[PDB]
Each structure stands twice: as C-alpha cells, then as structure tokens.
Subunit: 72 residues, 4 copies
C-alpha cells in the first residue's frame, strides 16, 4: 500500500518547478516594462527624422543660392 | 499514512495553479515577440535615414570647398 | 486501493503544462534571434553618429568663413 | 491495475525533464533582460545626438538667411 511519503519526490519536484516558473514570471514582467521604455524612446528618435529632411531641403537651396554667388 | 485520492488531487490543483502562471508567461512572450517585430521595423526606418546623413555630410563638404572658392576669388 | 486511473488527471495536467512550456520555449528562442537583429541594427545607427559631429565641425567653419564673406 | 510506486516515479521524471526546459527559458529571459538594458543605453546615446540635429537645423537656417544677405547686398 502506497504511503503519503511515497509522493514526496513528486511534491518537491512540483514545488521546484513552481519556484523557477515564478522567477521567469518576474523576469518577463520586467522585460515588458523595459519594452515600454524602448518603444517610447525609439518613437522619439523616429520623430526627429523630420529634422533630417528639413536640413535636406534647406541644403538644396544653399547649394543653388551658392551657385548664384559663384556666378557673381 | 496511506496515500489517498485527495493527495493526488492536491497535486493536480497545484499543477493547474502553476499553469495559470505559465499562461501569463506565454501571453507576455508572444506580445513581446510582436512588439520586437514592430520595433525592428521602426529601427529599419531610422537606419534608412542615417545615410541620408552621409549625403548631408557630402553636401556640406561641397559647400565648404565652395565657400573657400568665393574667398579665394575675393 | 488506488488504481492507475486515479493518476490520470495528474498525468494530463503535466502533459498540458509541458505543451505550454514548450510553446514558451519556442517563443523565447525567437525573441533571442530577434534581439540579435535589433542589436546589430542599433549598433549600425550608433556608428553613424560619427557623421553627425563631422557635420557639426564643418558647419562651424561654414559659419566662420561666411562671416568673412559678409565682411567683404 | 493497482497504482504502483513506478507510476509516481514516472511523473517525477516527467516533471524533472520539464524543469530542464523551464531552466532554458529562465536563462534566456535573464539574458534578454541584460541585453535590453544595454540596448536602452545605446538608444539613449542615439537620442542625445538627435537634438544635435536640431542645432544643425538651426545653424543651416542661419546660413540660409546669411547667403540671402550676401545676394541682397550684391
């Protein structure tokens, strides 16, 4: 007849699995928070690409206006 | 003490409780997978503009040699 | 006397846990690969910051050389 | 068939095998946590340079008004 103690190894194995799963949970919740931060900052970088092409358009005018000066 | 059905049932509920934590992990890593894919797309867009900077650097060098030409002509 | 079938619910519960853990594993291996790609591309962006300050130095000269032209 | 110790032992080994997969997940998510921290630091460095672009845009606008001044003076 099986005894309660015959289940001990299985109980301990599940306890250990639960401890390690809990640490995964803690870590992935932190990854979720980190990803929020990364997304916000990448969106910030991407918005500044407006500057880039404004600089681009202005430089076109600077090149043209300067060919004028070279002519004069 | 003889092993009883209730002892096995206790482990079932423990495993099913653990399964809820596993389910949260799985939902969250799938969400992270989708969000990292979107992040890479935006990083791609930033990269494409970066060498437009290379052209800017070239245009500016050209403006430099020109302005020297103006001064040299006097 | 407990019978083999009395363990069925526990066996099934562990099978389901294993299936779902396997899908987490598949997903996190994919996150690892995605992170390699992100790291490589962010390093690429960061290196181009050299351009930025080169543009910065040159513009300083353009501002100065141009004050000269304004004087002339 | 009466439940036997070997039936319980089979579940122990199954759980311990599952634990190896859990261990790989845990090692990998910890590594991802470290790498996302480093990634954010590099994203910070990119952000700091981005508004140096804002100054560039300003200097270029100034060069624009100047070059018009040169042409206007003739």
């Amino acid at each position: 007849p099986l005894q309660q103690g015959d289940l001990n190894a299985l109980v301990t194995s599940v306890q250990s699995l639960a401890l390690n799963v809990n640490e995964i949970l803690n870590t992935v919740r932190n990854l979720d928070s980190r990803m929020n931060q990364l997304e916000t900052k990448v969106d910030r970088i991407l918005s500044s690409q407006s500057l880039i092409q404004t600089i681009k358009n202005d430089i076109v005018g600077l090149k043209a206006g300067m060919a004028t000066l070279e002519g004069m």
